Write a protein that binds this ligand. Structure first.
Ligand SMILES: CCCCCCCCCCCCC/C=C/[C@H](O)[C@H](N)CO
Ligand SMILES: CCCCCCCCCCCCC/C=C/[C@H](O)[C@H](N)CO
Ligand SMILES: CCCCCCCCCCCCCC(=O)O
Ligand SMILES: CCCCCCCCCCCCCC(=O)O
Lengths: 57, 274, 178, 251, 251, 274, 57
């Protein structure tokens, strides 16, 4: 039950504890530490992979 | 660490055929040019991060969505309770933040902030106990109370929360309760198959109502109260980002507008001053 | 017919036939005059959302010498309701031959774009119509009653689901019962 | 490279000055899996008879022109057998491939923005009212934007810099877009997948996405040159399937 | 056994007094192989939207009746999406399943012959002339036989004992046939494969086979009994595919 | 997972002697026909569940069962306290949910919501301390208090809860306290062996009484209060399901009714419009 | 005492902790995660097992 996770500190006793008390997944706290990203779907939505140094046309 | 930004690798002079600055926007492509392609840079270790700019850190802040008033008087039984068809369109600060995305799927915490006062006039109270409020959620199709002191305030299946004045605000959690698989903020279509009826998102909003009342008669005077509902979307996934809105909103059920200018004016095209 | 036993009975008759419908109703198991007061629709009014496939079983309660064939159609809600058997044969339909086995289950599929439908439906989550038409008609021998009676049944399949409890809009009161 | 060819069904499309192919939000149009499907009955899948290129009407890029829009799949109502399956089936699900072509010259100039806007909800011109269906999309022709304000009581607000939606027209580049620059480009092809909140939807009361063509840099030329520069739109459905077969409505 | 059920598409057919299922000349309807095909392009294959049961019009077996015929696939011209693929595609190839049902009583009597005649070329009534298309097959109703000689100048010779072809009506039992005896039988189902000399053929100028229903033993009853005995025909295409997609004609 | 619904297995065409649609209701049997027997279906993975439709998720929601008022005045000592013979028949929303089953066996949480006001008239209070309420449960046969300030309010063995106004509502748990092995919602029989007396469930209801009062005199004015009792049945087992009721209730001790129509009317038997 | 059980989530840190504080079994929380069922007692209350594909009579 003790899900020991790390706190938020800036890169130049950092762990916290969290218990799920209620029987529903919507009762939990916010998922504030999921930091994935994939910007290639909007920046490079091409069929062919485009190289920077190679010319486009 | 996660989720930091890219570092600028060091760069010297160059004389190449591989020019990275010259590109073509006609392909619909945003360029990947970092500053090391057009000038000499130095090796810095960028320790910044994008934790504050994620979807969950952007939307997990409570915002007001309604302001409802109700009395404890005698006569006009529509004023003895308040109603709300559940929307995210009536208050603009949360409406604009949602409408940067087409679809949304999340859970929610809902906080009720009730603040009362004493109504003026003769025959005041001068000694009153604390007030208690019942905030019933009616899923779509249930028995609507016609007034306070009704049979529909029993709520054997409707979720109700009772709250005395003076304590912490009431708060509960709500799952993703939609019929589909995402809360559609935009719906380009109709309600009937003959292309008639209600154009827009107002046909997709079937979430139910919210009713709030005083469970106490008092028997001497009138005390008004103001329910303020607060919405905090958590566990948020979002799809298909939209441009942010430009013209101010007019209606709570439409995207109707009046045509506004694209920006604010300035004196000249070359106006680096002052 | 609602203050008698005749609400549960379907009239079928003799000559000639088949330019007439047998019955017809919308597919709305929680909000309809037809089958919101049945066993399926009473538990549906305790919930807001529903899903799954609904069965309809039809018993022929005529004499044992009477023949007949019927068309039991179901139509998705995309277009207008059918007005004859040429428009009703294009939807999901079975053909019921009345014989030694006197029942036929028309199983309405779950065709929608959403995973759930509302119980108190609307123009968005409409499900369609259920019609019945004469295929051939009743042929009885001499000395037999010319008209018969069909009964309709309704239940759920094994993939039915309900969600979002609420109070029923079916029973009321004014003061405390003494 | 600048030469491409897109073959779907019994129809091909050849280009010789192409930018690239923008493919939606990354994904390719496909069929509905068994993991996500909710319709119980068997879906139909006409491969060649439905998924092929359909050429829409042609418009005229004038020197004072400002923009047009087509709403899909309502623009292909009477286009072949794709429009005949829409009337007979209550449900539908398809991706598209939008080829827009406009060749002028080495001596003409101009620019266009070809966006595909999912769920492009459009605002009326008389506020505190509502649009009708005959003002949102014509039967095959293009509905155009107006440079000034629209005065009508039941029409779309067809002003161009608010894009008919209330947003900035420069910020439409989030959506899958290309540019037809007459200096470098000749055609613009965009492959859009099926974008919806539900797995399938009835394609009569729900415009899935709107195609907009807006000239940012207008068209100018010299009197020796040609004075008729048309734009042609050619849209092919891709991986189309349907459910809920009943009588045709309408009609 | 006497109970059967035939499920095709989104439609089922239930019977409780069945003779058997005659299956053509032995073989089952299938798709065209790559060994025999001659059309180069990709064929379309709508599984559920085309191959399903279609109920035709109903006729009335009177006590003085003599026979009817339907020509296929012209009888399913306006039947659903099967008739919409015929107009858009130049080529077509399909097998069928012909369910004919007529229930009367334990006190009625009669007999019927339900044959499927491939390439039923029919003779005119005025010799040294030729029939027209409006006299061979109606739009959905049945073309009937006459007990006497036909006097018309451009109609089929609808005499019944020559079967409209010049042959003996008793010798029609070579073709796939059943009998609806009202003493023992209630319905008659016949599964016919694709019978042609060419691998595919245009199904507007070539009636593939003709369904004939002829009462050999006529209908009699008693005045206490019912006086309306109808026959209903329900035909489903099976393994249908098409080639040559062009504009719809007609229309 | 648990407890999901069945998937629809894919199906092709068929020509069989095994017809599953033709059945016989005369055996008293509901058919097991899934849609794959009458039409061609596709393989979908149905991920829906029936967690919201179980017995425990259906009945574990609190519902009001009584509304009782009492004074703090002088004179008429029957108004100085309230009484309740314990029922589940006085409020209809919980009465109808229980009466879908013949027998019931459960535990319970009981929540008391007390809400006061100040009574009008001359000689008001203008400065009052908080109120405190005593809610005594008397098992069947105990000493009934004749008024407030009685000897029976000592409650050396009767369970009593004292509650000051302004805090959270009072709540306790109660086991399965019946004499038999199930709370009989219906009892087709009599009370005496000579087939005389009380026909119905009112002879089986022997659960005791509930008494509520103000433990404080005040000494200046009158303040009425309204006790609302809430019942949440947990650990629920149920047997022999009944049809839901059609006609509205009249009495709190009878199943007496007036004959109502079976449904609401419609225009025609073939009324697919509109 | 730490009865670590799973939360409620929809199939496409899910565990919670629960202690029993009081000495009575009626004091516990609700048994909201017991999802058994047996509908054969009301749907098929027969003496002989009936097959779907086989005829009833
Ligand atoms: C008295 C107890 C009150 C219980 C509170 C629950 C009531 C609120 C339920 C609805 C909230 C779900 C979130 C709704 C979001 C918007 O409707 C979507 N953005 C529009 O589709
Ligand atoms: C002041 C302390 C109050 C203590 C509260 C306990 C009083 C309530 C005890 C009786 C409640 C048990 C549940 C009763 C249910 C119904 O009687 C049955 N459905 C009918 O047999
Ligand atoms: C209902 C929640 C009560 C608090 C949880 C019990 C006290 C903490 C126990 C820590 C160890 C739990 C087992 C692991 O996780
Ligand atoms: C009266 C209850 C006090 C709280 C319970 C003690 C604190 C949590 C202890 C967790 C380990 C208990 C042993 C197991 O179970």
């Amino acid at each position: 039950g003790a899900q020991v996770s790390t706190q938020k500190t800036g890169a130049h006793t950092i762990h916290y504890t969290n218990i799920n008390y209620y029987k529903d997944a919507a009762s939990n706290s916010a998922n504030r530490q999921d930091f994935t990203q994939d910007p290639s779907k909007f920046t490079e939505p091409m069929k062919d992979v485009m190289i920077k140094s190679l010319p486009a046309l | 660490a996660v989720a930091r930004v890219a570092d600028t690798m060091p760069t010297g002079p160059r004389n190449t055929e591989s020019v990275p600055a010259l590109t073509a926007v006609e392909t619909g492509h945003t360029s990947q040019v970092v500053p090391g392609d057009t000038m000499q840079t130095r090796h810095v270790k960028n320790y910044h991060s994008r934790t504050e700019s994620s979807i969950e850190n952007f939307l997990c802040r409570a915002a007001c969505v309604y302001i409802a008033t109700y009395k404890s008087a005698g006569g006009t039984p529509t004023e003895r309770y308040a109603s709300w068809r559940i929307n995210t369109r009536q208050m603009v600060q949360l409406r604009r933040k949602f409408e940067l995305f087409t679809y949304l799927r999340f859970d929610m915490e809902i906080t009720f902030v009730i603040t009362s006062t004493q109504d003026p006039g003769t025959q005041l109270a001068q000694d009153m106990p604390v007030l208690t409020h019942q905030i019933m959620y009616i899923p779509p199709g249930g028995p609507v109370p016609n007034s306070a002191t009704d049979f529909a305030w029993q709520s054997s299946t409707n979720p109700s929360i009772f709250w005395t004045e003076g304590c912490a605000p009431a708060r509960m959690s709500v799952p993703f309760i939609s019929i589909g698989n995402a809360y559609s903020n935009f719906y380009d279509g109709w309600s009937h198959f003959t292309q008639e009826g209600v154009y827009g998102f107002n046909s997709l909003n079937n979430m139910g109502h919210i009713y709030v009342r005083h469970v106490n008669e008092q028997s001497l005077g009138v005390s008004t109260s103001t329910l303020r509902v607060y919405f905090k979307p958590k566990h948020v996934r979002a799809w298909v980002p939209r441009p942010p809105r430009l013209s101010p909103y007019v209606k709570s059920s439409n995207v109707n507008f009046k045509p506004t200018a694209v920006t604010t004016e300035r004196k000249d095209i070359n106006d680096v001053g002052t | 017919n609602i203050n008698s036993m005749e609400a549960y009975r379907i009239p079928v008759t003799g000559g000639d036939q088949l330019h007439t419908q047998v019955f017809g109703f919308q597919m709305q198991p929680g909000l309809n005059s037809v089958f919101k007061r049945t066993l399926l629709g009473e538990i549906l009014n305790y919930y807001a959302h529903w899903s799954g496939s609904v069965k309809l079983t039809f018993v022929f309660c005529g004499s044992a010498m009477a023949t007949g064939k019927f068309l039991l159609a179901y139509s998705p809600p995309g277009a207008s309701p059918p007005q004859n058997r040429k428009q009703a044969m294009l939807g999901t339909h079975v053909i019921w031959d009345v014989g030694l086995q006197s029942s036929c289950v028309l199983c309405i599929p779950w065709i929608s774009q959403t995973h759930y439908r509302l119980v108190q439906q609307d123009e968005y989550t409409s499900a369609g119509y259920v019609t019945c038409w004469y295929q051939t008609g009743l042929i009885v021998p001499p000395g037999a009653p010319p008209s018969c009676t069909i009964l309709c049944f309704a239940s759920a399949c094994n993939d039915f689901s309900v969600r979002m409890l609420r109070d029923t809009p079916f029973i009321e009161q004014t003061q405390l019962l003494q | 490279d600048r030469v491409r060819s897109i073959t779907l069904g019994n129809s091909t499309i050849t280009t010789q000055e192409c930018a690239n192919v923008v493919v939606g939000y990354g994904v390719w149009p496909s069929y509905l899996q068994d993991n996500e499907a909710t319709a119980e009955d068997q879906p139909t899948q006409p491969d060649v008879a439905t998924c092929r290129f359909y050429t829409l009407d042609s418009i005229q890029w004038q020197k004072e022109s400002d923009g047009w829009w087509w709403k899909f799949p309502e623009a292909l109502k009477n286009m072949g057998l794709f429009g005949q399956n829409m009337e007979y089936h209550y449900l539908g699900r398809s991706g598209y491939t939008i080829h827009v072509q406009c060749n002028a010259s080495k001596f003409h100039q101009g620019c266009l923005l070809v966006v595909c806007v999912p769920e492009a909800e459009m605002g009326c011109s008389d506020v505190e009212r509502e649009v009708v269906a005959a003002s949102l999309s014509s039967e095959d022709t293009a509905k155009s934007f107006s440079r000034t304000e629209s005065n009508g009581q039941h029409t779309v607000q067809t002003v161009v810099y608010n894009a008919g939606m209330g947003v900035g027209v420069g910020n439409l580049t989030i959506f899958p877009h290309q540019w037809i620059n007459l200096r470098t480009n000749n055609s613009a092809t965009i492959v859009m997948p099926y974008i919806n909140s539900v797995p399938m939807d009835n394609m009569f009361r729900h415009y899935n996405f709107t195609l907009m063509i807006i000239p940012f840099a207008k068209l100018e030329y010299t009197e020796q040159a040609s004075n008729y520069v048309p734009i042609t739109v050619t849209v092919a459905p891709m991986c189309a399937e349907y459910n809920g077969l009943r009588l045709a409505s309408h009609q």
